[PDB]
Amino acid sequence: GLIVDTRDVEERVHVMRKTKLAPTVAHGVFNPEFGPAALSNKDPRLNEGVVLDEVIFSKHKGDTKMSAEDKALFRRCAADYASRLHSVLGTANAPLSIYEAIKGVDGLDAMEPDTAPGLPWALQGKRRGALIDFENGTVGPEVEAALKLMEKREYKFACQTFLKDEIRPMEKIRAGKTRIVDVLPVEHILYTRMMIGRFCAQMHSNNGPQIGSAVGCNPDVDWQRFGTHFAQYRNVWDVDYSAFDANHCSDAMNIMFEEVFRTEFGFHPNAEWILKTLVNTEHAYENKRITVEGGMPSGCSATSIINTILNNIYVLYALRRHYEGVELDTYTMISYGDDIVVASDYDLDFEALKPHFKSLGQTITPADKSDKGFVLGHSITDVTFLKRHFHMDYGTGFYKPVMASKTLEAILSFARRGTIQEKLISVAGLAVHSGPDEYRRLFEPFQGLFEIPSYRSLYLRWVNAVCGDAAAALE
Ligand SMILES: [Mn+2]
């Protein structure tokens, strides 16, 4: 995005600044090239003469401005993708009730308590539970005040910038490339789910290539569905972006909101409005008041979906801007926010597309980062998606989501105090696809210390999960 105003205020919005991630016994055994993010300017492990607060905002390199022709083209791609999208999902996008927005529906999880509620409930020492009733599905005084202020299209807000306390590669840590979360007010989040929560629900349960979205998928069972789809195509590309979230330009955002969330598709008129309030935002990080034009706030509750929608339009736009007669069936794809797999029987040159993507302020890059650029002939078994490869299971003949063993080591090395046991069982479900020998090795350090699920129990669980027929095809 484009920063238009840095300014200082003495009501400090303080951030966290040390990690919750204590090492585990796995740490000493594996010695991973990973560790907690850098949360303090004083962090020893940070390269000398690097201040945490500046590199944070180096992602805002400008808000790309598009020509009248490129905008008309983008609008067509947005309208075409929107056409596909609503054709699959239907047009029953009437506002969710407050109860339904709090508690969720089929396809949409309930809103969370115990997480941040944003501003200025941080400035009033007010906690999520104090504003809304999560079991009752009801709201309090000022949030209802703020609710019917957004009806009236007035709503003053700022984003609260947090530092993401997470495991990162040791280099990102010495470089101080700590990721950030923009926590919006809880009234913003719930209203957004009132405006578009029914649509998001439909997206989740209809995830797949046809809508180009994996948001709400279950990789354990859906890898078979996705893998077999992309195996049918002659070319498969693993496309990476540089700072996808931050580089959504004002023109692309506004136009996608205008084309996707129209009232003719059964949205309330305020769906477009509430989404449009994410374009020019207000970030109370570090020295509080920083104003940004362009880019998507990293974290809203519809971020994954919005980043997915834009990703789908970006690809259509880039291809149409280089080739002629490019339509939605010219290629296939699936994405999850910035993460994307593309495939086609056409021999599309993603190296030539680079500038066309750059007209949107987006920089595409091959996943390898080697060769010299995008090559052809790659298949579904060469790519990473949701940090998972596609591999064939020997026993079933299904695709399984395999994670890099060194990534699993990193995840197994650090954990919050008192959660290790739960985290192991959780991570066991991920590691089971790495095969029995590597599974045994990854969980060696916890032998006789924590309960470790047997490889066989999770394999049988997974087999039935992929489809009961396979599990029943035995015995
Ligand atoms: Mn990727």
Residue numbers in the entry: 1 to 475
Manuscript text:
To investigate the structural modifications associated with the changes in nucleotide affinity, 3D(V173I) was crystallized and solved in two different crystal forms at 2.6 Å (P41212 crystals) and 2.4 Å (P3221 crystals) resolution, respectively. The superimpositions of all 476 amino acids of the two enzymes showed root mean square deviation (rmsd) values of 0.33 Å and 0.62 Å for space groups P41212 and P3221, respectively. Despite overall structural similarity, some significant changes were noted in the polymerase N-terminus (residues 14–18), and loop β9-α11 (residues 293–302, at the N-terminal side of polymerase motif B). In both space groups, the electron density indicates high flexibility around residues H14–K18 and this region could not be traced in the trigonal P3221 crystals. Two types of changes were observed in loop β9-α11 depending on the crystal type. While in the trigonal crystals the G299–S301 stretch was disordered and not visible in the electron density, the tetragonal crystals showed a 2.5 Å movement of G299 to S301 from their standard position in the wt enzyme, packed against the fingers, to a configuration where the loop protrudes towards the catalytic cavity in an orientation that would disturb the binding of the RNA template. Thus, localized structural changes are associated with altered nucleotide incorporation tendencies of 3D(V173I). Thus, the parameters of presteady state kinetics suggest that substitution V173I attenuates the mutagenic activity of FU by forcing recognition of the cognate nucleotide.
Here, we describe the selection, isolation and characterization of a FMDV mutant with substitution V173I in the F motif of 3D which is able to survive the mutagenic activity of FU. V173I does not produce direct resistance to the inhibition of FMDV replication by FU, but compensates for the increase of A → G and U → C transitions that the wild-type (wt) virus endures in the presence of FU. The structural modifications associated with the altered nucleotide incorporation have been examined by comparing the three-dimensional structures of the wt and mutant polymerases by X-ray crystallography. The complementary virological, enzymological, structural, and computational results presented here support the conclusion that the V173I substitution in 3D restores a required mutational balance, opening new perspectives on the role of mutational biases in viral and cellular evolution.
